[PDB]
Amino acid sequence: PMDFSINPPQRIVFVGLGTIAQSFLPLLSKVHDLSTLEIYAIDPKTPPLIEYFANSFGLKFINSAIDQINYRDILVPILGEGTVLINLSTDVSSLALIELCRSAGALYLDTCIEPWKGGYDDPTIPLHKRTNYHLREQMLSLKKRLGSGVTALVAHGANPGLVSHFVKRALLDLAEEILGDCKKPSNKEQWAILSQRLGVKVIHVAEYDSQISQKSRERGEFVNTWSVHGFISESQQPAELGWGSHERSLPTDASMHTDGCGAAIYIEKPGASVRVKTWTPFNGPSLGYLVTHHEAISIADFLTLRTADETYRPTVHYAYRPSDEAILSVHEWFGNDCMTPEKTKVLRPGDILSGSDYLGVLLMGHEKSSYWYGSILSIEKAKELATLNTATTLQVAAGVLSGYLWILSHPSAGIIEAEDMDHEVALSYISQYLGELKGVYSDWNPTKNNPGTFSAIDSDSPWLFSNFVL
Ligand SMILES: NC(=O)c1ccc[n+]([C@@H]2O[C@H](COP(=O)([O-])OP(=O)(O)OC[C@H]3O[C@@H](n4cnc5c(N)ncnc54)[C@H](O)[C@@H]3O)[C@@H](O)[C@H]2O)c1
């Protein structure tokens, strides 16, 4: 059930005008006439293309930094009914803006629950209160307090965001193939009942970035297909993962949250040091980094089934195989005591020679072993679909556009996550920007090629976390 056309708002406000924000303006141009809209962008960093932006939409740019002092003064004159606040910044508290948008009655959209300046790596803050799990529980507590009201969709980019919709569709594919049941769940509980009935035990966000760089890294240069400092920051945080009801042995140097709706583990080691085996359509078995991610918790909680005596819950976490440049950069990064790099470079469309960003979810434990579903977007395809976009950026920008259109057509939903949306509508908005949406089955498991652990008669034994992590 989808709206043929969604009317534009009266005003848009971009808190932060970085890569993703710029990668998103072209996509937004096709949908809505940016000249009939008053569009603000608040960023302390003036971009080079700010002139072309002003000579196409009349972009009212504000060179300022949003902090606890001046945020309630730069925005209040700008926020109101009919305004959409799109937060694509760093160091700005999403939760702080949510409450502010509720007062002004404005719609809110972001791709990450960011705290204020320095909320991730703050030694003065206790560790267990610096995890994505804790950031999410703050959002959920604010969701309960505010309750019904103007919509605010958080953490809806590519991942977290689209991948949540991929999980739902993957479950329906498995349901049609294994169970012959074409019945769509109607609520969270029914989604969890389906995951349990199929026997889903492990879900990976298995991403493989095969994009090749035009030129080679210069000395001391950290290169990546998206934000370098955003990648280093996520790589530095402790690895987190949803812990499933099938697991037995616990990871080493690990702690756990159990006061919520499901077990959530955070390992006291950087995600860039925790390597896990996974599977992607690029070349099958792959090695990724167990990077902490929002969807690792939201997906697991979404498919958690708690009854009087039993509990069902899959293991869910990110498995990221980044570009060849980032891997080599991470290597040198460790060699320099993880100090901030001398030089940085986010690869642009002109810098990428070939390759694709395989972004999808890998569901495991069911009758057919492994099933991968997601977006396979090549760089060449992205260049023909929009400007200022790589394969990595376009998948995110598409996620932003999807959430943008949902909050306009559903502006009275309060605070919501990707799981609260209608995945069918969410993907139909932007399916054309995701290149190839395919589902691939595979008889793979982390023990198939390791004689020391291979088993074909113990059902869930091959799906234990000990078999995935190195
Ligand atoms: N869900 C996803 O798939 C996904 C993918 C990538 C990024 N993101 C998120 O989107 C957000 C933006 O990421 P990006 O890749 O474009 O990073 P970026 O660094 O290219 O852009 C972030 C921008 O925010 C600006 N900024 C920093 N402090 C600010 C302040 N106090 N006030 C206003 N602006 C400020 C910076 O100048 C920068 O231009 C991040 O929070 C990131 O976590 C989500």
Numbering used by the authors: 0 to 469
Paste lines from the article.
Bacterial HSS is mostly found in α-proteobacteria and in some β- and γ-proteobacteria, including pathogenic strains such as Legionella pneumophila, Brucella spp. and various P. aeruginosa strains, including PA7 and PA14. It catalyzes the conversion of two molecules of putrescine (PUT; 1,4-diaminobutane) into one molecule of sym-homospermidine [HSP; bis(4-aminobutyl)amine] as the main reaction along with several side reactions. BvHSS forms a dimer, with each subunit containing a boot-shaped substrate-binding pocket between an NAD(P)-binding Rossmann-like domain and an HSS-like domain.
The reaction mechanism of the nicotinamide adenine dinucleotide (NAD+)-dependent bacterial HSS has previously been characterized based on crystal structures of Blastochloris viridis HSS (BvHSS). This study presents the crystal structure of P. aeruginosa HSS (PaHSS) in complex with its substrate putrescine. The PaHSS structure was solved in space group P3212 using the Phaser tool implemented in Phenix and allowing both enantiomorphic space groups as possible solutions. Six PaHSS molecules were modeled into the asymmetric unit and refined to a maximum resolution of 2.42 Å. All six PaHSS molecules contain an NAD+ molecule in their binding pockets, and molecules A, C and E additionally contain a PUT molecule in the active site. We assume it to originate from the expression host and to be co-purified within the active site of PaHSS. Although PaHSS was shown to be a monomer in solution by SEC-MALS (the theoretical molecular weight of the monomer and the estimated molecular weight according to HPLC-MALS were 52 kDa; data not shown), these interface areas indicate the formation of three crystalline dimers by the six protein molecules within the asymmetric unit. The NAD+ molecules similarly insert their nicotinamide rings into the active site of the binding pockets, albeit with a slight offset. In addition, the ‘track-and-trace’ loop and particularly α-helix J of PaHSS are shifted in relation to BvHSS, providing more space for the pocket entrance compared with the BvHSS structure. In conclusion, this inferior cation–π interaction geometry in PaHSS might be the reason for its reduced activity compared with BvHSS (see below).
